[PDB]
Amino acid sequence: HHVDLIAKKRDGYELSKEEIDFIIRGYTNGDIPDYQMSAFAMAVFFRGMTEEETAALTMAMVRSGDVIDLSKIEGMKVDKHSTGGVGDTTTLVLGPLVASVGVPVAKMSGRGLGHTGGTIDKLESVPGFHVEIDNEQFIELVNKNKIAIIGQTGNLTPADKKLYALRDVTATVDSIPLIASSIMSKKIAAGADAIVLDVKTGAGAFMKDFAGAKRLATAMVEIGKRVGRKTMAVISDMSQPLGYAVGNALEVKEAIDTLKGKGPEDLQELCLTLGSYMVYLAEKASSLEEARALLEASIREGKALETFKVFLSAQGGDASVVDDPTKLPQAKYRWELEAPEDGYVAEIVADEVGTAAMLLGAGRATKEATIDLSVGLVLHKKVGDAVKKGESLVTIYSNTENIEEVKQKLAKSIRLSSIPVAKPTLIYETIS
Amino acid sequence: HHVDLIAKKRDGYELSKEEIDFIIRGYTNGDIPDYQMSAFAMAVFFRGMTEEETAALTMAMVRSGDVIDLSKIEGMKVDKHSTGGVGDTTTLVLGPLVASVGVPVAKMSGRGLGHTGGTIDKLESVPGFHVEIDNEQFIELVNKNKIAIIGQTGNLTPADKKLYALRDVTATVDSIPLIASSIMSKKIAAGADAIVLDVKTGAGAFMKDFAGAKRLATAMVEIGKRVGRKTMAVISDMSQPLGYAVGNALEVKEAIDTLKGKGPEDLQELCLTLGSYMVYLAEKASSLEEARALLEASIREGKALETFKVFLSAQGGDASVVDDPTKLPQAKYRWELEAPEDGYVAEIVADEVGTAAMLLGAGRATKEATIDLSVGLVLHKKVGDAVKKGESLVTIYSNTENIEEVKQKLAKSIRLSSIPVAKPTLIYETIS
Numbered sequence: 001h002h003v004d005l006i007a008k009k010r011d012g013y014e015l016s017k018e019e020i021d022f023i024i025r026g027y028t029n030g031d032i033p034d035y036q037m038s039a040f041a042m043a044v045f046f047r048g049m050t051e052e053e054t055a056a057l058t059m060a061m062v063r064s065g066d067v068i069d070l071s072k073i074e075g076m077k078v079d080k081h082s083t084g085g086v087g088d089t090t091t092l093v094l095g096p097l098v099a100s101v102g103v104p105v106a107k108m109s110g111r112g113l114g115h116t117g118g119t120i121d122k123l124e125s126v127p128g129f130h131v132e133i134d135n136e137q138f139i140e141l142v143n144k145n146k147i148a149i150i151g152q153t154g155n156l157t158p159a160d161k162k163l164y165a166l167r168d169v170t171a172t173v174d175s176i177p178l179i180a181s182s183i184m185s186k187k188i189a190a191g192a193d194a195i196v197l198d199v200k201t202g203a204g205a206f207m208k209d210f211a212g213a214k215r216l217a218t219a220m221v222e223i224g225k226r227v228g229r230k231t232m233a234v235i236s237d238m239s240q241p242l243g244y245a246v247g248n249a250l251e252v253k254e255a256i257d258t259l260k261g262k263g264p265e266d267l268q269e270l271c272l273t274l275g276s277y278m279v280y281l282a283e284k285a286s287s288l289e290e291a292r293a294l295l296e297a298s299i300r301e302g303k304a305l306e307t308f309k310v311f312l313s314a315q316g317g318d319a320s321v322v323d324d325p326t327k328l329p330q331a332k333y334r335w336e337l338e339a340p341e342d343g344y345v346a347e348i349v350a351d352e353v354g355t356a357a358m359l360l361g362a363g364r365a366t367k368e369a370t371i372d373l374s375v376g377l378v379l380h381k382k383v384g385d386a387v388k389k390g391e392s393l394v395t396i397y398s399n400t401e402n403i404e405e406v407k408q409k410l411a412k413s414i415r416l417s418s419i420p421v422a423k424p425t426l427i428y429e430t431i432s
Numbered sequence: 433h434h435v436d437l438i439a440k441k442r443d444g445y446e447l448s449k450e451e452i453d454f455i456i457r458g459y460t461n462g463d464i465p466d467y468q469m470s471a472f473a474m475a476v477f478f479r480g481m482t483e484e485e486t487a488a489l490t491m492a493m494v495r496s497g498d499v500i501d502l503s504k505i506e507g508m509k510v511d512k513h514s515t516g517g518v519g520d521t522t523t524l525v526l527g528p529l530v531a532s533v534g535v536p537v538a539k540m541s542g543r544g545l546g547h548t549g550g551t552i553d554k555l556e557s558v559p560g561f562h563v564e565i566d567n568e569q570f571i572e573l574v575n576k577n578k579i580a581i582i583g584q585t586g587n588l589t590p591a592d593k594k595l596y597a598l599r600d601v602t603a604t605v606d607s608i609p610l611i612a613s614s615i616m617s618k619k620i621a622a623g624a625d626a627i628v629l630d631v632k633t634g635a636g637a638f639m640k641d642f643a644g645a646k647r648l649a650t651a652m653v654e655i656g657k658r659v660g661r662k663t664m665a666v667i668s669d670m671s672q673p674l675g676y677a678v679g680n681a682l683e684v685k686e687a688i689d690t691l692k693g694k695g696p697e698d699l700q701e702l703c704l705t706l707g708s709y710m711v712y713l714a715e716k717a718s719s720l721e722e723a724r725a726l727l728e729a730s731i732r733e734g735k736a737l738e739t740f741k742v743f744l745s746a747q748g749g750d751a752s753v754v755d756d757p758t759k760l761p762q763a764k765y766r767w768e769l770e771a772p773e774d775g776y777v778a779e780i781v782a783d784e785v786g787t788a789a790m791l792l793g794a795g796r797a798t799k800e801a802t803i804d805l806s807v808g809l810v811l812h813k814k815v816g817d818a819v820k821k822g823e824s825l826v827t828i829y830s831n832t833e834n835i836e837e838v839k840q841k842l843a844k845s846i847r848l849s850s851i852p853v854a855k856p857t858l859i860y861e862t863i864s
């Protein structure tokens with residue numbers, strides 16, 4: 001009786017590969033009912049899984065569906081995953097950036113239900129840009145330009161879709177082996193040969209303390225070691241929002257700034273770090289140092305920006321947004337939230353900035369909502385900055401003037417100290 | 433969202449009475465699906481419940497259905513519950529025994545799926561005895577004779593029926609608060625004013641170590657303290673089968689022996705102990721010592737036996753079985769299992785004797801099977817007894833001669849040492 005599988009995990013014993021395969025296959029097909037799977041997931045929450053178990057679980061979820069074939073795209077396929085957070089524009093920058101030095105970027109994604117738009121929602125800020133190409137045109141564009149984007153249509157990791165939904169309604173999301181296997185299985189099924197992970201830490205991150213962030217990163221790197229997909233993880237800071245802009249059109253404008261070498265310092269450093277790992281793992285550089293140098297040169301010489309222009313134009317977008325960002329959707333109203341006193345920024349509560357952006361309408365809440373891509377916010381002070389009373393802490397971009405609740409949430413989220421504060425560490429450590 | 437209730441328990445926090453009531457009511461009615469209840473039960477398995485939580489859970493399960501009204505039966509209603517085990521004939525003896533000194537025994541029970549027949553299955557060994565009376569005749573007989581038996585028909589603790597079934601298929605049976613609340617809720621819903629518990633310990637018991645037996649007993653006594661139903665628990669030994677007979681007709685014959693003061697010593701001592709507590713709690717004696725003396729006198733003077741005769745006759749049975757046990761169903765075959773060597777009985781593996789009785793057909797396996805009430809076994813040596821090679825260790829009563837598997841299981845279950853062995857302790861301790 002299937003109950004034995006639950007009992008075994010409950011008692012702290014390691015499931016075999018055969019048992020993990022059996023339970024995932026039966027749950028996927030309906031042989032194992034949801035109430036047994038949820039008891040099993042709670043037992044995992046308390047007793048965990050070994051590295052061998054976690055890798056077996058990852059591959060059982062990969063095998064539950066289809067695997068995207070990228071063999072006709074020349075080169076190693078390296079993919080990036082972040083748990084993300086408020087202001088994380090890295091995906092918009094990293095594509096053109098690494099593609100400009102020869103790393104093929106075969107980007108597949110789907111419209112999310114998150115706190116901002118997904119990559120597709122954001123890129124659709126660009127007039128004329130649309131992602132409705134078939135797989136052949138996708139392959140062609142990647143081999144020609146080294147970058148393209150398509151909407152995910154494959155039946156990937158159906159077992160993960162099902163199990164993550166169940167976890168979400170049974171208080172079993174917060175389990176390192178379940179999180180690690182979910183994320184990695186999705187990247188492997190999408191055809192990654194190698195994987196770069198940005199694991200966030202701090203109050204704005206998925207894992208709310210550094211130890212947990214490190215354990216998650218380690219778990220995913222070990223999965224990759226065992227399934228033959230080299231994986232490297234950077235642990236980076238989300239104690240405050242990244243960069244300045246939170247939104248859709250606003251984050252595209254900031255990404256354009258960053259590709260020109262004049263973006264926020266934190267986003268620039270993060271994109272250079274993640275991208276150096278992507279370039280090295282893709283074997284388009286002989287070392288991380290060489291990869292970093294190539295990306296700094298591509299930025300300063302304008303090649304990453306030209307790559308972005310090629311990418312936009314190839315799928316219908318008006319690349320002139322790079323010269324004239326006013327062609328992105330513009331907000332009807334702008335408001336300056338003034339500082340109430342002199343001081344130094346000691347904290348920006350990332351979760352609350354995210355909530356403020358959501359209240360303005362920058363994110364999706366129902367499976368399909370239409371999003372006003374013009375709205376959001378641009379922070380002007382980050383942790384460590386000096387502030388004078390009356391100085392603008394943030395600009396609020398809205399489609400109406402009825403934003404008192406947004407003003408109050410943002411004012412409360414920006415914490416000042418009367419004495420100077422140090423910059424937090426951005427890049428904590430690399431796990432490989 | 434109901435998920436919060438799961439998360440709270442998962443994180444180790446105490447649910448309030450309101451929350452326990454809400455979750456039980458919603459699960460009972462279907463508002464809370466099985467996969468959330470099973471995640472909750474697994475969280476309880478790991479994090480447990482306080483005494484207040486466990487009492488709230490007990491009463492929420494009582495309130496989920498009907499409560500039997502015994503107010504027309506005069507006197508305090510005291511009920512007994514045992515987790516039971518191989519050879520436990522106490523329920524057959526205790527009824528007539530305590531009724532003979534004025535304790536009203538309003539016995540309600542239903543046919544079980546256990547390793548022997550239930551009380552009703554066993555009593556139906558008596559020719560003509562049937563339990564098909566309505567509640568009025570039941571009340572009348574208890575007030576006249578101080579004892580009667582009826583088949584449970586009330587919709588009692590539907591929430592417990594549902595949750596125990598779920599626990600059985602999710603590896604969440606083995607949880608002290610869940611076990612304690614299940615047992616006590618059933619006894620409270622049946623109308624007990626006071627409760628005597630026989631919590632077994634040892635390899636033949638529900639709790640497989642003494643510490644756990646003691647924790648379960650303590651948990652149930654505390655429930656009773658908080659819900660206003662005085663509860664006392666005896667921890668007793670099931671390291672070996674109780675008494676000699678395992679079966680149906682065979683255990684009735686042994687119960688008759690015990691009521692005459694010539695039964696097995698262990699069963700006599702257990703019935704005197706449990707019954708003294710029942711008599712005292714029913715306020716039919718001023719102290720446990722007086723209660724014990726009254727029961728010893730009732731046995732030696734033949735009054736408990738006459739009470740059994742009244743009980744049998746009042747519901748159709750041929751009371752002459754008390755003088756002539758051959759009127760109970762007789763087995764077609766008897767086999768003596770001889771000892772293979774000289775020695776001393778060091779162990780009788782209770783679970784395996786139970787399995788042997790089941791193989792002979794003494795128990796039910798499908799919801800409704802017809803049971804041959806004649807079959808089973810009579811042990812002739814208990815732990816501590818001296819044995820000679822060739823002496824009968826047990827008599828096997830069967831309806832065919834094809835019992836090689838029974839012989840082998842019983843031979844392996846009776847363990848001999850070459851040097852003398854002490855009698856185990858029968859009564860470990862009383863919790864109140």
Ligand SMILES: O=c1ccn([C@@H]2O[C@H](CO)[C@@H](O)[C@H]2O)c(=O)[nH]1
Nearest residue numbers: 082083084164178179182183206
């Ligand atoms: O079990 C998990 C947890 C997180 N995520 C990823 O992490 C994001 C949240 O940090 C999600 O939207 C998803 O992309 C998963 O895929 N699976």
Ligand SMILES: O=c1ccn([C@@H]2O[C@H](CO)[C@@H](O)[C@H]2O)c(=O)[nH]1
Nearest residue numbers: 514515516596610611614615638
């Ligand atoms: O959760 C539980 C566990 C045990 N029991 C009782 O204990 C017996 C097994 O020891 C069962 O048949 C039943 O009567 C319950 O009622 N509920």
